[PDB]
Ligand binder design. Structure first.
Ligand code: TSQ
Lengths: 309, 310
């Protein structure tokens, strides 16, 4: 076990029965890959948190700084991508995760890795490949061959790492299903929710400027939350409610003037959810509480990233 | 003879003639072609090898890529099986009299540097472009594979890796070749050979279609295939027998004929043979019989070299 702790705040495990089997082993391993990102935001942190969960549960953690994939996803030049990966590694360690950090290009260009990419290319239809990239592929009016190489590259990555568990965001689930159908060793997949962007108009993303970075200043965090989409009574699609759900600790103390109800103690996110859905808790008061608790959560991350000056 | 005209003869397309002249000014110059290994080597293969000998006769160092990785990506089986067919293809090409550098594509196409550049070209090649370039090359498939769109860029980078001045192939290769001219910094001169018509007259000739004459077909099989072949009187376009006459027969040619039907005709040019056949002067039956016996004699030293171990 540790099963329930691992399942907490994930969208799906494929499959739970297979995960319980993995959890019986003395030795188990789990991996995730991150295309390097110039800013590291709460979407990354949610995933790192889950890797820390797995680590707490006796999993050896592997982190792929997926520079080759970022390159195939048109994020730029390989050496420039790798340097952002270097910075991403420091952020992940500052979040509390000690793990094995590999750059994808350390093994994803070996001849026998490459031969298996082409073997997998013989078994992956263009349709399957294109459909697995719909939520991942950079936007492009003239889609590139690189886009359908990207998923078979990610599948072969998992093949060569040989872990028991693969972790990723829900946008990754079609690539994960492709690896389960194509590979001899079937990996247990754990998928994290994809956070909603701050203006509520889509999914949070490094390229859309609609995120909170883990090293944003408290003042920037307060401004981003203040201006955030947060309809009273509306929980689904609400970025503020999501932050409250996936990062904050409970009981939660929501401070208010006496004229609007005075201070409030919420013992659970579910309790928080009905209060807000009922319109008992106003969006301004929710924002203030989420902002101040989130600043404290991100405080020691930001400090370690800045304490060199 | 003039090197340019010797290279140009019986080709369908040069990209471009002006770049071909500038390459022929150089003392050191190379040409290359790839072949997916094929269980039977046929007249379409022969025509291309004859063009490589032309180029070699004009001072080009020849490279022949036995294209095993590409054949692998194009669903021709496993590499060891493919490579073994490649070994056989190499003997046939030599039995055709082509001394050249023979390479297996896999020898260099899985290198780390090579692979990175494949991925780089994949960023610059659209899916629609890649698929268009493969329309005459891809193995038929109800559910097309990613392998199909990797194939063109594998071929493109292969030429980039070979450093050749000239790239030779059939007309089915011309989209891949124009893609290579767009994407690479050295623009390669492309010499395209015609694709022969099938022996039944319908559609192009193809290993997969079994509508060809193999260079090691027995005389009786050759005569039989030719006797069967589509050959309307006075119909030159799409006439596989007239194609063979034009691309493989040697002139002046002596069409044997009964005296009762005119006697031996000595045609010293394909063009007149065309004009003769055009005006229905020269009958199909008489054309088939001359083409079959000439071709048998053309192909005889090759079949002999290949059957010599027996
Ligand atoms: C530019 Si090259 C010498 C790496 C090259 C050329 C042609 C081929 C094979 C051809 N497409 C076929 O179907 O036989 C392979 C490689």
């Amino acid at each position: 076990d540790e099963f329930e702790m691992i399942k907490r705040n994930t969208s799906e495990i494929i499959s739970e029965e297979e995960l319980r089997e993995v959890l019986k082993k003395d030795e188990k391993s789990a991996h995730i890959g991150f295309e390097p990102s110039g800013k590291i935001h709460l979407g990354h942190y949610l995933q790192i948190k889950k890797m820390i969960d797995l680590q707490n549960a006796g999993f050896d953690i592997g982190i792929v700084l997926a520079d080759l994939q970022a390159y195939l996803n048109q994020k730029g030049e390989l050496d420039e991508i790798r340097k952002i990966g270097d910075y991403n590694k420091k952020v992940f360690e500052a979040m509390g995760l000690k793990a094995k950090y590999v750059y994808g290009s350390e093994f994803q260009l070996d001849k026998d890795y490459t031969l298996n990419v082409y073997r997998l290319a013989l078994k992956t239809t263009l349709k399957r490949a294109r459909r697995s990239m719909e939520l991942i592929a950079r936007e492009d009016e003239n889609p590139k061959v690189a886009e359908v190489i990207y998923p078979i590259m990610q599948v072969n990555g998992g093949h060569y790492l040989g872990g028991d568990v693969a972790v990723g965001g829900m946008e990754q689930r079609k690539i994960h299903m492709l690896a389960r159908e194509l590979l001899p060793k079937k990996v247990v997949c754990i998928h994290n929710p994809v956070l909603t962007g701050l203006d509520g108009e889509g999914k949070m993303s490094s390229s859309k400027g609609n995120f909170i970075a883990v090293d944003d200043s408290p003042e920037e965090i307060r401004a981003k939350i203040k201006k955030a989409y947060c309809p009273a009574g509306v929980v689904e699609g609400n970025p503020i409610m999501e932050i409250a759900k996936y990062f904050l600790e409970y009981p939660l103390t929501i401070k208010r003037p006496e004229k609007f109800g005075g201070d409030l103690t919420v013992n659970s996110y579910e309790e928080l959810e009905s209060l807000f859905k009922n319109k008992e808790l106003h969006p301004m008061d929710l924002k203030n509480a989420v902002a101040e608790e989130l600043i404290k959560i991100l405080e020691p991350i930001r400090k370690r990233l800045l304490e060199h000056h």
